[PDB]
Amino acid sequence: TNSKGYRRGTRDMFSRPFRKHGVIPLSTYMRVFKIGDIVDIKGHGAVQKGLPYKAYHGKTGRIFNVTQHAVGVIVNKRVRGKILAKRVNVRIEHIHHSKCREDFLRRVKENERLLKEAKEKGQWVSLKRQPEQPKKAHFVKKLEEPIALAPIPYEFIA
Amino acid sequence: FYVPAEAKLAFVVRIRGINKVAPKVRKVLQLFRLRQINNGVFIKLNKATINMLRIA
Amino acid sequence: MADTQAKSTTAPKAAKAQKAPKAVKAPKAEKPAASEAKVSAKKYKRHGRLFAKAVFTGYKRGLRNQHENQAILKIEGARRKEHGSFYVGKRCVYVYKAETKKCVPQHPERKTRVRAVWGKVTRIHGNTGAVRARFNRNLPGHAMGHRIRIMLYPSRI
Amino acid sequence: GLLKEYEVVGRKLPSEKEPQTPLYKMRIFAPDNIVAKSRFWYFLRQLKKFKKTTGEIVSIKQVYETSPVKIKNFGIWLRYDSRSGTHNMYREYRDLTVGGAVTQCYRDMGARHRARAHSIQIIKVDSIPAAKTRRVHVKQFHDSKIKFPLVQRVHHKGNRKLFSFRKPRTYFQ
Amino acid sequence: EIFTVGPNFKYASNFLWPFKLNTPTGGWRKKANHYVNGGDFGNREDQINRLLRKMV
Amino acid sequence: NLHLTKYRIKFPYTAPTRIVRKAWTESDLKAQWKVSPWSVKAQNICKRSSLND
RNA sequence: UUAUUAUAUGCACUUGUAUGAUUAACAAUGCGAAAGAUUCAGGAUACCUUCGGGACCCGUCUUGAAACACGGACCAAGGAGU
RNA sequence: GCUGGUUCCUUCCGAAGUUUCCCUCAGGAUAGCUGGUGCAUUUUAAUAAAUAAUCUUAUCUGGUAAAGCGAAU
RNA sequence: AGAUCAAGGUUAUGAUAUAAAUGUCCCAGUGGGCCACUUUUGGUAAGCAGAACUGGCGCUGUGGGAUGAACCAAACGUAAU
RNA sequence: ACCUAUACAUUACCGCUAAAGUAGAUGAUUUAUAUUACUUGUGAUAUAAAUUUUGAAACUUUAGUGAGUAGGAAGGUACAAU
């Protein structure tokens, strides 16, 4: 009859997944985050002074706090419906980077350079993003082994 | 073996009502401007509209 | 092989004739070498002189509506949908008797005992020859089994 | 449909780690030229890895049975699935063409076994010459010549006059 | 800029209002399922022309 | 779909049409067809067709 | 070279093509007849007469009333948002 | 906080049956939905290089099937 | 981190926008619900209860399984085809 | 091959929502004609004729569009006395 309160429902979430227990790495005690370096909020089991509570874990956010050994985030969570902002304070080793910006920054500097090579011939930019297309119309020699090549099933009886 | 070209330029005509429609197929279908029965528009095909076209 | 069938049955336009577009006969003839022209026989029944008789069978009835602005007919000559399409576009007229006169004979003579609403058939409906039909007013409702008529007007060949 | 015949080859799109994929082929009898295009995937998903869309369907080819005027009979192997007794199966039906020899075979398999079309895979079609048909309801027709006064009609019943006058007296000998 | 597909296409069919196709006489054959078992809606892609000769 | 006549003409059961084209003229059916006394009755599709006015 | 097309038709006129939700020449049928008054369509105005389908008999609380759920015999005047 | 009745016509729009709190559990406040009242403005408002919503592209996110006992428990 | 100069393509995924954008009255109501598919506890169970995610019924006529608030077609200005 | 829905389409029509147009009429406007400046030919003058009104809360025109109790605002009518 309960959630209500403060750490219930942490079966596979809040601990350490397999073969990573014990002493923390020291890479994540080194990282640096400016204002606007978009970052994630996730779970941990090796700094037991601080957590993001039962709903947040698995969400990412902006950073507008720079402090002693903490990070204060903006994050969106579902109320019904007034989806608000929330300011959560947390010690740093709960937190991983976004890599979702980390494709986009090399989407920038290619476009500053591929326009820069375009600045000698003019046409054309072609600088937006497009997924795969309907391709072509080949003609295909066998070339490699003419047809039939006939796999027809018969397998049930066992 | 000469393949034909697999094509762009589809054309999409609604078939079924306004009602008894699935949850997130209500926003996709207002996102092609098919609303009434037997209305149609065209698309520019790629993968990025197939998995909009598949969810209707 | 079927290319002469794009040719040989234009001999009806050569036996009518108009511009004579075929020399091979297709004659339905009594000759042993003349075994063609392919009639979709049989039927042999007239119902076509004038007021060719066709009794009436209720409105274009839904199961649970009416749509009484139209009406549906039973055309006693016809029995397949190639028959009845010759009853496109004819009028449809039905007489039924009543008491008084109340009108002088001026457009061509009428002592006025007969009274008749009017109309016009359109299209073939039933896969055997029942052919629905619209009237001037509405087919007065008690006629389902009255002997209404179809006159030849207008007609062609 | 009348179950026309298509042969069909798949592609497995040409990914650079191994270009020129081996392009396997089926033999599909199908109600339509539009529907074998997504039946070939059902046969192909029994053997290779190959899922749509990681492969293309290079040319379906309608093939035009060669000897229609002759009356050559065929056997078909068969995989029916009834209620739970999915099996192997061998039959034959004596037909004119191969394309008529699969409509009839469906519409016997749906006729005595109920065997819907979602449980039949035409695994093989062989042109049997003679002398190996087991099939007692067929090979009694091998016996040319035959007297055969099985006098039938359409029994068009009867015809036009729904109140006739002339007593329709079938046998007429 | 539609039948040949080009780079002005995206503005070349928001320019059309959706049509008002009538209803295809002969009918719809079943309207039950996807094309490749029963037959109607879906990946039909080539027999759309026998529809639009009727439906429009 | 068909009714039968009464004139059996010999052929091999795997005959091409050309010997049937040969033998049908040899079996003089086209002579004796229109003399069959109730294929005189066949002439109501060959004369009583359309029975002009 | 061979095909091809539009541009090189002003001047008045014409019941005249098409254009402003592109329907209209003809023909018949008839006198708004001093007052009087025939003709053609319409017309359940609210009946009665004749047939085809429809169809539970009205408030209301409730998920649900045709209710084998409560209130209603009929009518005129009075009555509840100040 | 419980039942009965709460009287003229059309046009427009069109819900609730939930969370909390309460000697409340047949009721009320509360947000919720709705309706009204305008008001500020987009080359997304008047003779796009800016937005807000679904898929794509990319990037993180969970232990439920399916498994798994020739690992723990 | 801030203010301020210097260089800068066509603004950077698709498809739309029946128009988007907000402050009051806290505005009348309503705070008892029902069902089918999957997913599913309680119980042997039921046209019972107890729910999460949708669609619908209450608010809704309707054409169709004679019948039936939900079933499946389709969501209802007056008219002919 | 046919079968029927108040659904789908097209023509009318109703109301509703949206968009858009119209006010120097002691003018505007054609139709003719006299003349003319004459610029071949386009314009101004003069005569003759006729069309030209609305609670701009009007009027024209255009597209789309219409279910509904619980409930809120919209103009409309009865029965009053001042």
UniProtKB/Swiss-Prot annotation, chain D:
GO terms (BP aspect): cytoplasmic translation
A molecular function GO annotation: structural constituent of ribosome
Segments traversing the membrane: none
HAMAP family: Ribosomal_eL20
Cellular component terms per the entry's GO annotation: cytosolic large ribosomal subunit; cytosolic ribosome
InterPro entries per UniProt: Ribosomal_eL20 (IPR028877), Ribosomal_eL20_dom (IPR023573), Ribosomal_eL20_eukaryotes (IPR021138)
Domain of life: Eukaryota
Keywords: Ribonucleoprotein, Ribosomal protein
Pfam families: Ribosomal_L18A (PF01775)
Descriptive protein name: Large ribosomal subunit protein eL20
Species, as recorded: Drosophila melanogaster
Protein's UniProt keywords contain Isomerase: no
Family, per entry: Belongs to the eukaryotic ribosomal protein eL20 family.
From Swiss-Prot, chain E:
Superkingdom, natural source: Eukaryota
Organism: Drosophila melanogaster (Fruit fly)
Identification of the protein by name: Large ribosomal subunit protein uL30
Parent-protein residues present: 197 to 252 of 252
Function: Binds to G-rich structures in 28S rRNA and in mRNAs. Plays a regulatory role in the translation apparatus; inhibits cell-free translation of mRNAs.
Family recorded in the similarity comment: Belongs to the universal ribosomal protein uL30 family.
Swiss-Prot record, chain F:
Highest taxon of source: Eukaryota
Signal peptide range in chain numbering: none
Similarity annotation: Belongs to the eukaryotic ribosomal protein eL14 family.
Protein name, per record: Large ribosomal subunit protein eL14
Organism: Drosophila melanogaster
